[PDB]
């Protein structure tokens, strides 16, 4: 049984100051995506094409329209709104330690046990968001089920990994930019 209730973000307001973090982290997430594509021999094209390995978003984040930037900014805003809804504090406590994209490597950033615990809550909320969306999709398309429509805690480690990776990346990037996140 699975009744996912992701945190309701619609009326959560992110403080204006965090817009600098949103834009830097959006840029990073695009750069990481682009890096992997370019490593796999992808190139700029006017259309997405898996045969030719072209993609129109293989160019600098700074050249994007607002709409295209929002592709990366929206999920980050949704993450921060969850954190704010949970009454976590996010404060710039320290100076940050921070077409051929070469994004920062996050593999050397270590989260405290307590930040890892916070990453688990984020990960579960990602799963709940996907899950509630998936139930609506299924019903709109005529029913059926999906094997991952189970509570987060019941997922295997492999099934948890994508959500865990997402949550860690956000917290690591916050830490690298000098933010303390507490509850």
From Swiss-Prot:
Q: In which tissues is it expressed?
A: Detected in skeletal muscle (at protein level). Fast- or slow-twitch skeletal muscle.
Which windows of the sequence hold sequence repeats? 1-98, 99-183
Tell me how the protein is altered or processed after translation: The N-terminus is blocked.
Q: Which domain of life is it from?
A: Eukaryota
**Subcellular location as annotated:** Sarcoplasmic reticulum membrane
Supply the domain comment.
The calcium release channel activity resides in the C-terminal region while the remaining part of the protein constitutes the 'foot' structure spanning the junctional gap between the sarcoplasmic reticulum (SR) and the T-tubule. Pore opening is mediated via the cytoplasmic calcium-binding domains that mediate a small rotation of the channel-forming transmembrane regions that then leads to channel opening.
The misc remark on file is: Binding of [3H]ryanodine indicates that the heterozygous channel is activated by Ca(2+) concentrations 4-fold lower than normal. Single-cell analysis of cotransfected cells shows a significantly increased resting cytoplasmic Ca(2+) level and a significantly reduced luminal Ca(2+) level.
Known role: Cytosolic calcium-activated calcium channel that mediates the release of Ca(2+) from the sarcoplasmic reticulum into the cytosol and thereby plays a key role in triggering muscle contraction following depolarization of T-tubules. Repeated very high-level exercise increases the open probability of the channel and leads to Ca(2+) leaking into the cytoplasm. Can also mediate the release of Ca(2+) from intracellular stores in neurons, and may thereby promote prolonged Ca(2+) signaling in the brain. Required for normal embryonic development of muscle fibers and skeletal muscle.
Summarize the subunit comment.
Homotetramer. Can also form heterotetramers with RYR2. Identified in a complex composed of RYR1, PDE4D, PKA, FKBP1A and protein phosphatase 1 (PP1). Repeated very high-level exercise decreases interaction with PDE4D and protein phosphatase 1 (PP1). Interacts with CALM; CALM with bound calcium inhibits the RYR1 channel activity. Interacts with S100A1. Interacts with FKBP1A; this stabilizes the closed conformation of the channel. Interacts with CACNA1S; interaction with CACNA1S is important for activation of the RYR1 channel. Interacts with CACNB1.
> Its family?
Belongs to the ryanodine receptor (TC 1.A.3.1) family. RYR1 subfamily.
- Output this protein's name: Ryanodine receptor 1
| Species for this entry | Oryctolagus cuniculus (Rabbit)
Give the classification, highest ranks.
Eukaryota, Metazoa, Chordata, Craniata, Vertebrata
- Report which gene this protein is encoded by: RYR1
Shown chain mapped onto the complete sequence: 2734 to 2939 of 5037
């Amino acid at each position: 049984n699975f009744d996912p209730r992701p945190v309701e973000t619609l009326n959560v307001i992110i403080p204006e100051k965090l817009d600098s973090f949103i834009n830097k982290f959006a840029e990073y997430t695009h750069e990481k995506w682009a890096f992997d594509k370019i490593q796999n021999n992808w190139m700029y094209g006017e259309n997405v094409d898996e045969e030719l390995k072209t993609h129109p978003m293989l160019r600098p984040y700074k050249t994007f329209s607002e709409k295209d930037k929002e592709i990366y900014r929206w999920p980050i805003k949704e993450s921060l709104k969850a954190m704010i809804a949970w009454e976590w504090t996010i404060e710039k406590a320290r100076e940050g330690e921070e077409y051929n994209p070469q994004p920062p490597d996050l593999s050397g950033v270590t989260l405290s046990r307590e930040l890892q615990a916070m990453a688990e809550q984020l990960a579960e909320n990602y799963h709940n968001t996907w899950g509630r969306k998936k139930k609506q999709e299924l019903e709109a398309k005529g029913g059926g089920t999906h094997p991952l429509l189970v509570p987060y805690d019941t997922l295997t480690a492999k099934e948890k990994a994508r959500d865990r990776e997402k949550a860690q990346e956000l917290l690591k990037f916050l830490q690298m930019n000098g933010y303390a996140v507490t509850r």
